[PDB]
């Protein structure tokens, strides 16, 4: 599980209504829950096992000629050209994303919502109810405070400063 003390390798912590996760920088993809690395452009023989997308690596296909494709890791499946957990294949949240219930030994998909939205019990726990979510991110950098950007929380520059660093 990802907490406020997790170090996002080549990434940064973001917070939604029900969990935290690591978002990568620029064109980096998630190797695991907290590590971001460069992705390959084409799945070659040389790029086998190298990451091609979020939670996906290039593999070899023992076909009639050798073939290479970008397959999601174990426990993930491809939905809209994005690898999401297998238990989230048919869980749509609307104003949010599907995550695994960390407080349940059996893998179950639940809806984590954008900032300002909470799971609506009257809409199959989808993200269709107004509701604030207090930010718990530790933004300790020079003039960095928690800011809501693109439906998520993130440590950004204080209002009136721009990036080397915030000033």
């Amino acid at each position: 599980k990802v907490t406020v003390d997790t170090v996002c390798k080549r990434g940064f912590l973001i917070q939604m209504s029900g969990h935290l996760e690591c978002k990568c920088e620029n064109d980096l993809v998630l190797v695991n829950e907290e590590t971001c690395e460069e992705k390959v452009l084409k799945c070659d023989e040389k790029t086998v096992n190298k990451p091609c997308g979020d939670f996906s690596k290039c593999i070899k296909i023992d076909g009639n000629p050798v073939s290479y494709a970008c397959k999601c890791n174990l426990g993930y499946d491809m939905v809209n050209n994005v690898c999401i957990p297998n238990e989230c294949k048919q869980v749509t949240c609307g104003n949010g994303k599907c995550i695994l219930d960390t407080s349940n030994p059996v893998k179950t998909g639940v809806c984590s919502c954008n900032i300002g939205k909470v799971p609506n019990v009257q809409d199959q726990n989808k993200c269709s109810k107004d509701g604030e979510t207090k930010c718990s991110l530790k933004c300790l950098k020079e003039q960095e405070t928690c800011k809501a950007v693109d439906g998520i929380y993130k440590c950004d520059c204080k209002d009136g400063f721009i990036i080397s660093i915030c000033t």
Epitope: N95, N114, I115, G116, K117, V118, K129, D130, G131, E132, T133, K134, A148, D150, G151
Partner: antibody, heavy 128, light 107 residues
């Protein structure tokens, strides 16, 4: 500069109906939520209800004390907010404030829900 | 929401008004200043931050289910009624208001 001008207040007998109005100006009215907040003479603030923007399907929500009796309407093409009050009780007599809800993002949805702009208010009296 | 009905401080002192409630641990708390015969004005949002146009003497702090409004060096200009607000998304959306606090700058 932002302005919220209430209208329609007056004296009505108990059980009667009354409709309020609010002319907004100085901002994109269709982007914001709009709320009604009332305040009895010499008492605290009480929330009436809320109407949402097109991005949230113009849905509504009210307080339990005015549920079923009050109804909030809006006309984005006229920058107007309305409050249809029915079956008025003497407890409903108060000054009603037209309120704009701030804290929205670039998506039409909000990150926070606060009341940044208030109006001068209109007075509603209920007595026979 | 629950807040004291009245507080009193001498000029220059640091006034504090507390707002308590179980919904204060889930969503943020907002403070409004209302002078006699005038519309309320937001002075503190998101527990501790202040909007643009509010003097630096206004501030707040959050500790669990209790939020405290702080006014350092109270001016007679600050004598007004203060209401704390929040929200409850447990069922239908509900805006929560406190009883209000009459801040008197002693004269």
């Amino acid at each position: 500069e932002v302005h919220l001008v209430e209208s329609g207040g007056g004296l009505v007998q108990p059980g009667g109906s009354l409709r309020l109005s609010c002319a907004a100006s100085g901002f994109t009215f269709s982007d914001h939520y709009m709320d009604w907040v009332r305040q009895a003479p010499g008492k605290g603030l009480e929330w009436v209800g809320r109407i949402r923007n097109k991005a949230n399907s113009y849905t509504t929500d009210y307080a339990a004390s005015v549920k079923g009796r009050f109804t909030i309407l809006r006309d984005d093409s006229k920058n107007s907010l309305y409050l249809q009050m029915n079956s008025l009780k003497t407890e409903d007599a108060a000054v009603y404030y037209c309120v704009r809800v701030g804290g929205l993002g670039e998506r039409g949805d909000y990150y926070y829900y606060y009341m940044d702009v208030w109006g001068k208010g209109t007075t509603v009296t209920v007595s026979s | 929401l629950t807040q004291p009905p009245s507080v009193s401080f001498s000029p220059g002192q640091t006034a504090r008004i507390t707002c308590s409630g179980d919904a204060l641990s889930k969503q943020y708390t907002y403070w409004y200043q209302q002078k006699p015969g005038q519309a309320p004005v937001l002075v503190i949002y998101k527990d501790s931050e202040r909007p643009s146009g509010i003097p630096e003497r206004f501030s707040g702090s959050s500790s669990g289910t209790t939020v405290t409004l702080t006014i350092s060096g109270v001016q007679a200009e600050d004598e007004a009624d203060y209401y704390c607000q929040s929200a409850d998304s447990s069922g239908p959306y509900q805006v929560l208001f406190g009883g209000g606090t009459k801040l008197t700058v002693l004269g």
